[PDB]
């Protein structure tokens, strides 16, 4: 289901709770919110407060709050009041440009991985009524490109240009409760390096947690996809792909991965738990220039319907200005054993 | 050095080529190139040997000043140097002219053509307005010789009003009136067709042009001139004799009204051009008003006419009349509306007409390249080799 | 001035410092074993022995140059028609290492070394995807 | 500099009698208010 | 055009217009035109002492003494007649035309005035062709420095006349394109067996000029024309002189022509590449 | 062909492996988006420079980064005429590098031409189209150099014949 | 700018925005006799050779509308005068044109209907029609009395050259 | 209580009036009196126009407040001569009779807005660049320095450089167009050698700008030489040391104890400091100066040099927010305000 929103690349996209409005960055300092009016997408909202290119957009569903971070070293929390989206500024205290932003599962905090080798965990302080950021710095040595929260609003996966895939603890005492013990670790202060993994090389473009959070998976620039189990003695399994580097990875089940990137089509990976091994399951854009639906590199992948526990449709947003809604239910019967 | 520089003004209608140190150009050729693997690119002609030939196709490289086909421009300047000027390009500096509002990229292409193809020891791409102002110095016999003026450069393309301040052209106030020699020729041709017979269809463009060459003049007042032609119709209607190319014979036509209707479209563009309808005096006033206030008055005191289309009799004088009228009307209206007893100093508008009005740009280029300073303000081929084409993007002005 | 000629960024404690702590380096690939394989006509065995124990952790350039020269001698020692089978006898790591050695050997052309290295590269690409070339581009500790 | 002087050299021919020998019958007459 | 014409245009049009005006009876207009031609030669068309009825065409060559040593004056008097006048200060050969005493046919005088440089050059050629015809062997070679860095050597032998042009190419591209052109010249006798024999020596003087002070350099090439009696005879003397005295400018002109064509090809290829690149945009 | 098609295939594969660029704001400089392969201010963002050589004289150096790739080509030059034609063509094209958006104004040392493809170019152009353009460029530079050489030889032949025919 | 009427007086009658200037007509019509030797028809006939070229006219007065109407009729009259052989035949053609009924202001097909005003009542409509017809007859008569050269058999081309030129790009035929 | 607190920033670009504690100004309007611009370099030249301006501010159209029953805070430019300060105080006390009168240098207002007490403010605007150290919330006049390079001089340099590119510009007619070019494209280079290499060997700095007349001009290298005049005054024929050298010198001319605190809280303000890369360039040049003329060559102790030069994102209304904070968090004090009774002493 390919739709070409506009010719210029879409930097990032974020859906809402009902999956009826999509907020996209059209390689610009503006955020465009499209909604479905019948069977066509109508651009209905325009968000213009960033002084530079927007690099990350997330949409907290329950609070319906859109956090946008850009190269202007700023984060804005847009809230829909009356009929218009108005922003609240978020001080990040970062001297470099923000790259990725992700809301917490409980929507109490959001993480902004930036180019100052920092992750800014920002939370609302009701005492003074402005957002407050806390920095995770060590041992991040290069730019943080990707983030993904554990499904407990405490831990945090961080892919960084220093070739390291990290899992930190973002337990802010002023907004959270005591985190339950996890197989990743038991001692969980803020900024604690809960886990690290790496390879011979490769920038980590995308990280994603499993449904239970005991499994993390990151795609690196060296055409490799890695998955770390916390339960199985904190073990990493690496699959060196024969395809082009993968940019964005998301879990769809407990044992399945969908990763998209510069090869211009999503790919599926299966994690055999008993053997603890990743395997190539099959590309999800087998054709009936580029024969794939996306004419350029797919930049973002995100679960559309059912969430990470019951994912049946996901969405790929590319650098060709295209948004594709892939239904794994149809692809199950399309290919041989695409399960 | 010792050998004089080569001055080539490549206008849209007529290319004016010659050597520095001379009052008038040695060649005034049409800016046309007649062309048909191997050496076939040298089988071409330029100038009067390209207006009409049996087996050749004529093409005009320059449209509205901007060079369109650069290959044709290179071949044209090739036979300019080697067939007409007869100059060894490695020993002669070149003073090329550039159209107003010319892109620096076009300057780079011109420099590349001159250097990487002809290996000239130097090149200076001069702005035409400053050269016109230089030519205007021959008529102003006082110590008021400054490069601040309003050049009305009219040729065969578009008539540019160009305000030059302190030697630098104010490119944000240049305004083009799409009335030039070609429009006047078309209007006179239409007038001749609707009035007289015996004009060969293939010669109507020329037999009109010669009329516009010899019998035209601007009119102080249209109805008065019409009444003069009606009543005193012996000293105003002229006789033009021509020779038909086919079946050679003499034909005589009565050159009447178009004499004063030729340049009148400079002053009433709605006569011929329907899209453009404001007179050249209004265009000059608007151009100068758009300029900074500290330089507005000098632009009035020095209005320089350059190009053949400005060579019509009394054109400058009538322009002075019209511009003084509009300026005085504006001043009176402002004084009446304000009522503050400001009493501004009366504005003196002086359109400088000179004997070198026709080839003003080339005359300025010649007197510029006849000086010691030109050699120390050119762009030597050595500078081209070290720095690159960027040096020819800016050609410094002189006092 | 004269204070702008000092690159402060080099003396900053925030640059990505590669670990470079692999150590070991047991003389890299074995010269005697590959010589015996080449002399005995076991070309596939010669390639397999040449691709074992890469100098992925050796800091000195001399051992890397020696290993590259040995692998290059093996590669040009091959015949074209028998190249493809050899490429299929290596796993993902083996094909990635072979492409690293191929890209190293392109930098020092000699006679028809590039002509057979291009065939090697084509077969290695066919048998190991473009991700092998990507890993050649990305490996900080590369042969 | 030399440009101003060389341009002025023409002034002896330019600074002379009228261009038109007598304005012979075909030019707008002077005496207009202009 | 391919062959460089041997007639200076500016003189031709100026004198033709002046003679047409004189024939029409119109009052002559003052002319003061200084210009230049190939080989660094300077022309001056003026009026002596301000008299409009007389037009003086003066030619100034930086090497007129080396031609005067080979009977330059005798040829100029025989070709131009009484029109030759005492040269103007700063100029070598002056021709005076009285606008009140034109002959019946103006084409001949205008065309001869156009050939002023040709007749300045042709004295040495006439002398050495007569030397070849008369069999006067062993006469000293004529050296003509027609430009500052380029030289010319004329020599007469028993059965041939040698004309060496010592040319200097400014740029390396000039050097290589000249090598290509001269290689084509050397093998040009295949299509024409009656043509003069062209020889090229790059960076090295021929053995004939080795005993002389011929320059040596990477940018300097020597072009030797061997002209036979069928080209030095009276019937073909004029055409041979006309072509030989402009061969150098002809070669340089065609080198620059080749550069212009090469620029045209590059412009075409650049346009093709830019269209290909703009087609790669998602929106075209 | 014997070694042109395999060489072009290898170069195309390496370009696909290298023309995978994403927007990267500068780590060392605030609010700057510089091509990392040029500034080289961060060693972690610079990829390993690779060389693909057809022979000992014709080679392409592809050195990539997170947001930029530099592709330097050494064109074939058989003789002196080919050398001057190649150099003159390259300066011709590089003078208008503002129009060739993915072209450098000056080459790297030892190489004839240098392309710089930034993440912005891959954003506004199809990456596979850019790879195809680079390969088409490598082929057409050689083709046009050969065409210019043949044209110059034929032109010189005609000039010599025309001059010598009039004796 | 385009030339303008100069015979307007405050006491001059106005029919709508149309102006009822007097003429020296030998014919009979609503226009009163004018003591002065200059009339709006004569002023038009004079200014027409320079006004016809103007494609943009500003109506600064109400006699101006009379001027444009007479100018357009002059254009039509020269269109119909090209094919003639004698002054008497020309005058007969002028009378034939005058006795016809070109569109009056307000009716479709009349040029510059957005500039002129419709007649208010039937009496004013009849007055306007008669005035236009009288101006037409006088225009034709004073046109023929001077277009033909003083020596016989010459419909001089000095007025025939304007046949194809339309004032304000408008014509009474459409 | 008292309340009725109004703060009115009087910046050259715009006058912004509002109430204390407001996150954003309630009213903003350009300082236009009619058409004259008496605000040159922040120093008043025509006081009648400013009297009319304040009357307009306090008029019903803007604020509609009683001057005699309201507290006003005014913003003072650095190095304001005492004559202007005294005359403004007299104007407030006599011509308006404000109950609460206070004026302070823009540096302390900036630091209060950002939430700091000690630090150096680099306020560069259109007329002049000011470097103002502040210790314990009180501005130090002794260490304040002025560099006569600002947006106007950078714009003039950019015009000169664009003429060097062959673009027919004028210094009096095309000032605003080049000003917009400087805003949209110009930036501060980090390593001028490296930036010059990138400009002379690569076309990534070339950006197209559409002039009002429709002509497209490609601005390339000149994106970074225009702001470089701040660091190298000699490029615009101005005697000086440069903004970074001046800042280092004015810090080093202070007390030894406060140097470390001043290093870590150097804040930028003003429109002319919005150039990309300016904080990074200032940090690099200050580190180089510390290496050269404090460390004297060695690099071991350079890591201990903690410098934190942050340009605040909320730069547009810094002075107004500082005024609101100052006049809201501590308005209820008595000895702070200068009252009319003290004036009539
Ligand atoms: N009296 C006149 N004097 C000169 N030219 C006249 C005259 N009447 C008509 N013309 C015509 O006016 C035109 C002037 O052409 P001109 O050479 O000035 O144009 P250009 O090459 O475009 O000029 P420029 O060098 O200023 O760009 C010619 O066609 C010429 O025949
Ligand atoms: N985003 C920007 N990037 C670069 N320069 C900018 C930017 N915005 C504004 N400027 C420049 O900053 C200056 C504006 O100065 P500012 O608004 O701080 O005025 P000010 O301090 O009140 O002035 P003054 O010195 O006259 O009192 C102008 O030169 C303008 O061109
Ligand atoms: Mg022109
Ligand atoms: Mg300020």
Residue numbers in the entry:
A (entry chain C): 2 to 289, 320 to 370
B (entry chain A): 3 to 38, 53 to 415
C (entry chain G): 9 to 151
D (entry chain H): 193 to 226
E (entry chain D): 1 to 284
F (entry chain F): 2 to 168
G (entry chain E): 2 to 175
H (entry chain B): 4 to 37, 70 to 380
What does the paper say about this structure?
Arp2/3 complex is an actin filament nucleation and branching complex of seven proteins, including two actin-related proteins, Arp2 and Arp3, and five scaffolding subunits, ArpC1 to ArpC51. Branched actin networks nucleated by Arp2/3 complex are abundant near the cell periphery and around most intracellular membranous organelles, where they drive a host of cellular processes such as cell motility, vesicular trafficking, membrane scission, and mechanosensation. Among these proteins, WASP-family nucleation-promoting factors (NPFs) activate Arp2/3 complex by inducing a conformational change that prompts binding of the complex to the side of a pre-existing (mother) filament and formation of a new (branch) filament that grows at a ~70° angle relative to the mother filament. The Arp2/3 complex inhibitor Arpin controls the directional persistence of cell migration by interrupting a feedback loop involving Rac-WAVE-Arp2/3 complex, but Arpin’s mechanism of inhibition is unknown.
Here, we describe the cryo-EM structure of Arpin bound to Arp2/3 complex at 3.24-Å resolution. Because the globular domain of Arpin is not necessary for binding to Arp2/3 complex and was disordered in the structure, we thought that a more stable complex for cryo-EM analysis could be obtained using Arpin_CA. The structure of this complex was determined at 3.24-Å resolution, and as anticipated the map was much better defined overall than that of full-length Arpin, allowing for the assignment of Arpin’s side chains. The Arpin_CA density on Arp3 was split into two well-defined segments, one comprising the helix of the C domain (C-helix) and the other centered around the conserved tryptophan (W224) of the A domain. As observed with full-length Arpin, Arpin_CA only bound Arp3, which is also consistent with the ITC results and confirms that the specificity of the interaction is fully contained within this region. Like the C-helix of N-WASP, that of Arpin is an amphipathic helix (residues S194-G207) with its hydrophobic side facing the hydrophobic cleft between subdomains 1 and 3 of Arp3. Contrary to NPFs, Arpin stabilizes the position of the Arp3 tail in the inhibited state. Arpin residue W195 is primarily responsible for this stabilization. It inserts into a hydrophobic pocket formed by Arp3 residues V146, A150, W153, L163, M383, L384, V413, and F414 (inset). Contrary to the initially proposed model of Arpin inhibition through direct competition with NPFs, the structural-functional data presented here support a model in which Arpin competes only with NPF binding to Arp3 and locks Arp2/3 complex in the inactive conformation through interactions of the C-helix with the C-terminal inhibitory tail of Arp3.
